[PDB]
Amino acid sequence: AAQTNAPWGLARISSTSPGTSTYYYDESAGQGSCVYVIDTGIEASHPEFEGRAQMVKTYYYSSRDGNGHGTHCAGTVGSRTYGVAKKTQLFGVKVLDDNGSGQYSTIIAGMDFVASDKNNRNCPKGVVASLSLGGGYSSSVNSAAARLQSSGVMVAVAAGNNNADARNYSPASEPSVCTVGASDRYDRRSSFSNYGSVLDIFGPGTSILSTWIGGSTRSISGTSMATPHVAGLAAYLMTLGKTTAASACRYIADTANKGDLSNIPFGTVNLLAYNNYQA
């Protein structure tokens, strides 16, 4: 399948080179997989989601996205125009208020919710979780993400936007999950992107076009934007049978574009997510 005039990041994940604008992918498109977006919520009624998104949990007075951040990440996972995995199922878990902030205990509860809730959903091709969030180091936040991974869910988390070593942030520093940094359309490390030995992969993160609340669209930047590219790619690859939840992060790094990014500090992997699709 070929989507012309696609956002640059979708084209990049199916290209050996930068600078193209067509996204190529297998038409299975993540059908039969599920991705939990743990964030500020999802505007499920956005036409771009085609009925495939729904909220399943909130810790606040409403389950609606009054911020836009969670709607934008879910659009990069699975919207018809802006998503990697265009037939996957999206489940929203609102752990952040409409200002984009949330207590760690609420975030830990949301991770534990997903590890049980997936036994209530139909996901024959596997389960992914996308955590575009984080803060200072916390062993209890890391152990929550480690439990969610252990339960059979591919966990992808943002490295953080501090231009620093991600060892000092959580859940970025949990070694058992997939920690994602950000790159731009010229194959440069995004200027805000964290780095370090804990990072596993890079995805597109600067000037990313996606769904927004009010039925709109907009382009924003962050390692929160690169995380759903990798989350969506794992759901895509799990539907094709190429990998499993326990091993997708390893598979994605094994099959990535190697040595293509500039300004990667010594000791950080030089690996950009790639779907290896041959049309």
Burial of 63 per CB tally in 10 Å (0-12, 13-18, 19+): middle
CA–CA distance, 31 with 156 (Å, rounded to integer): 19
Elucidation method:
electron diffraction
- Residue 229 is among the residues annotated as catalytic for this protein: no
Torsion of CA 54, 204, 108, 177, to 10 degrees: 120
User: Are the CB atoms for 160 and 180 separated by under 8 Å?
Assistant: no
Strand 23-24 and strand 2-3: the pairing is antiparallel
User: Are the CB atoms for 129 and 155 separated by under 8 Å?
Assistant: yes
User: Are the CB atoms for 123 and 89 separated by under 8 Å?
Assistant: yes
Catalytic residue from among 39, 65, 98, 165: 39
Q: Is 187 annotated as a binding residue?
A: no
CA–CA distance, 275 with 279 (Å, rounded to integer): 11
Distance of CA 30 to the CA centre of its chain: 14
Q: Is 65 annotated as a binding residue?
A: no
Provide the resolution (angstroms). 1.9
- Residue 46 is among the residues annotated as catalytic for this protein: no
Catalytic residue from among 46, 69, 72, 229: 69
User: Are the CB atoms for 184 and 272 separated by under 8 Å?
Assistant: no
Q: Is 204 annotated as a binding residue?
A: no
Closest CA to 133 of 167, 156, 115: 156
Torsions phi, psi for 154 (to 5 deg): -70, 115
Cβ burial 184-215 (10 Å sphere, 16+ → b, else e) = bbebebbebbbbbebbbbbbbbbebbbbbbee
| DSSP states along 83-112 | -SSTT-EEEEEE-S-TTS---HHHHHHHHH
- Residue 224 is among the residues annotated as catalytic for this protein: yes
Q: Is 211 annotated as a binding residue?
A: no
- Domains delineated in the chain: 2-272 (3.40.50.200)
| DSSP states along 223-245 | HHHHHHHHHHHHHHHHHTTS--T
Q: Is 260 annotated as a binding residue?
A: yes
